Amino acid sequence: GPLGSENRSKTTSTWVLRLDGEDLRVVLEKDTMDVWCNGQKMETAGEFVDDGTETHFSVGNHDCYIKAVSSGKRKEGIIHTLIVDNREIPELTQ
Numbered sequence: 001g002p003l004g005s006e007n008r009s010k011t012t013s014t015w016v017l018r019l020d021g022e023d024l025r026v027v028l029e030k031d032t033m034d035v036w037c038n039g040q041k042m043e044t045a046g047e048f049v050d051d052g053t054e055t056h057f058s059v060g061n062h063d064c065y066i067k068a069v070s071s072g073k074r075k076e077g078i079i080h081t082l083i084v085d086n087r088e089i090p091e092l093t094q
Contacts, residue, residue, distance in 0.1 A: 014092040015082040028066055028080050035066060
């Protein structure tokens with residue numbers, strides 16, 4: 001319950017998936033493109049490719065990862081897509 005903001009997630013991504021037997025909430029902060037799950041700074045790979053970023057973070061007995069894709073001239077607009085077990089994950093946006 002932060003004492004600020006209201007409805008602005010342009011620089012922050014979120015994903016809700018049933019993990020660990022409960023509604024696992026994942027968030028991708030633009031600050032360091034890090035992943036936040038169960039109130040615990042996840043550990044990604046931070047591999048920068050020719051175009052886009054492949055965040056590789058381990059989750060218990062599973063292998064999840066955030067598929068990032070840059071669009072525009074260079075870094076105009078970037079979109080992150082969480083994936084768990086080779087399965088796309090819906091973002092809070094829309």
